[PDB]
Design a protein around this ligand. Structure first.
Ligand SMILES: [Ca+2]
Ligand SMILES: [Ca+2]
Length: 279
């Protein structure tokens, strides 16, 4: 399939070169996969989700995304126009309040929730969790992410936007999940993107157009925006059977565009998520 005039990020993840504007992807589009978006919730009523998004869990008075971030990242995972996996099932886990903040314990509970709740969902092609959140290092947040990964969910996490070594952030630093840095449309490491040896992959993270609450759209930046690209990519690849939850981060790194990003510090992978789709 070809989505013309796609968001640059989508076009990039299906391209060996920057600066193209068509997103190419297998029409399976992550059908039969599920992506949990563990964030501020999802405006499931957004027409871009086509009824494929639902809230399954909140730790607040409402499952409504009063913030937009989780709606934005869900849109990059799987909205019809802005999504990588345009047919995946999106499950909203509101671990972040409408200010985008969430206690570590709530975040940990939500990760554990996903690890069990996937047994309540139909995801024959596999389960992904997009964690577009991040705080300072926490062994228990890292361990929660590692349990979620261990349960058979492909966990993508934002490397964080501190322009620092992600070793000091969580769940970015958890080695068994997929820690995602951010790049821009000129294939530079996003100025804010964390880096370091724990990074597994880069995805488009600057000026990512995607869904927003109130049925709108918005372009924002962050490794939090790169994360759903990789999450959506993992769902897409698992639907194609190219990989599994356990192997997806390794597969995405193996098949990434290599050595194409600029301003990658020494020691950080120079890998850009790439769907390897040959139209
Ligand atoms: Ca987003
Ligand atoms: Ca890793």
């Amino acid at each position: 399939a070809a989505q013309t005039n796609a968001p640059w990020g989508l076009a990039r993840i299906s391209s060996t070169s920057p600066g193209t504007s068509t997103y190419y992807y297998d029409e399976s589009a992550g059908q039969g996969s599920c992506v949990y978006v563990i964030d501020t919730g999802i405006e499931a009523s957004h027409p871009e989700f086509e009824g494929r998004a639902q809230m399954v869990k909140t730790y607040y008075y409402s499952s409504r995304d009063g913030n937009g971030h989780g709606t934005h990242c869900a849109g990059t995972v799987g909205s019809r126009t802005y999504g990588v996996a345009k047919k995946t099932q999106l499950f909203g886990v509101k671990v972040l309040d409408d200010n985008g903040s969430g206690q570590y314990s709530t975040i940990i509970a939500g990760m554990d929730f996903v690890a069990s709740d996937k047994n309540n969902r139909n995801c024959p092609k596999g389960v992904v969790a997009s964690l577009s959140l991040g705080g300072g290092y926490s062994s228990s947040v890292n361990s929660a992410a590692a349990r979620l990964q261990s349960s058979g969910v492909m966990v993508a996490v934002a490397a964080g936007n501190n322009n620092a070594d992600a070793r000091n952030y969580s769940p970015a630093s958890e080695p068994s999940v997929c820690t995602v840095g951010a790049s821009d449309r000129y294939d530079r490491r996003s100025s804010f993107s964390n880096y370091g040896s724990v990074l597994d992959i880069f995805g488009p993270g600057t000026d990512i157009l995607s869904t927003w609450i109130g049925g709108s759209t918005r372009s924002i930046s962050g490794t939090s925006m790169a994360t759903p690209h990789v999450a959506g990519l993992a769902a897409y690849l698992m639907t194609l059977g190219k990989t599994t939850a356990a192997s997806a981060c390794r597969y995405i790194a193996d098949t990434a565009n290599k050595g194409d990003l600029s301003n990658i510090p020494f020691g950080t992978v120079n890998l850009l998520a790439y769907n390897n789709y040959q139209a």
